[PDB]
């Protein structure tokens, strides 16, 4: 493809250059070409992939919500039209990632399998944010199943302070509140996740405790805004 004549190592190098330059579209593109070499990604490579696509899709969601809110207060076809144009681009990026996950990445180490399944649920969540009708809750089921399988693996194979486990549960909680119309389970899981991290705070790791304490603060922040 676009990047198939480039060495995988150079693609990783340039993904990092693009991150320094805040060229997240380029970053995602280099990382996609790297994934497509057919070898698995290290922890650091996994995170370059997630960062790139999160920035790209994050800016698309921010634009969609602007226009969508304008489109609500307005109720000429121009706002619908343009909202729909951004919506269709957002859907294309989600499909790209979801295809990368099912075609190459998901397949491994437990932290690895949780990571990708949490991404599958996340980008199914972003599609759900803009979908409607029969297509919609087909998406919601897809998101839930990806999240559920990831929760089971992380409870079994990861300590309760692990930042992927914590971050997974923060996002599954948000899925419950904002997507599945169940503030109850959202609050329960957020509080269970925090309480259990504190019960076994001795499991924090030299390499990752800063990350865990941050996600734990975010779990409290979501409970504070939901109470």
């Amino acid at each position: 493809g676009a990047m198939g004549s480039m060495e995988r190592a150079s693609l990783i190098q340039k993904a990092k250059l693009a991150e320094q330059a805040e060229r997240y579209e380029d970053m995602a593109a280099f990382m996609k070409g790297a994934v497509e070499k057919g070898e698995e990604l290290s922890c650091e490579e996994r995170n370059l992939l997630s960062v790139a696509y999160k920035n790209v899709v994050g800016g698309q969601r921010a634009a969609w919500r602007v226009l969508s809110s304008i489109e609500q207060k307005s109720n000429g076809p121009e706002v619908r039209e343009y909202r729909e144009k951004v919506e269709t681009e957002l859907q294309g990026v989600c499909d790209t990632v979801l295809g990368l996950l099912d075609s190459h990445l998901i397949k491994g180490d437990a932290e690895s399998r949780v990571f990708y399944l949490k991404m599958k649920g996340d980008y199914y969540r972003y599609l759900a944010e803009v979908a409607t009708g029969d297509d919609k809750k087909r998406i919601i089921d897809s998101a839930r199943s990806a999240y559920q399988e990831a929760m089971d693996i992380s409870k079994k194979e990861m300590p309760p302070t692990n930042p992927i486990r914590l971050g997974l549960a923060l996002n599954f909680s948000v899925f419950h509140y904002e997507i599945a119309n169940s503030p109850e389970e959202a609050i329960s899981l957020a509080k269970t996740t925090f309480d259990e991290a504190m019960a076994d705070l001795h499991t924090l790791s030299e390499d990752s405790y800063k990350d865990s304490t941050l996600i734990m603060q975010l779990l409290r922040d979501n409970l504070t805004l939901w109470t």
Binding site: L170, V174, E178, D221
Partner: peptide, 5 residues
């Protein structure tokens, strides 16, 4: 919006 990571 609530926080995600």
């Amino acid at each position: 919006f609530p926080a995600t990571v």
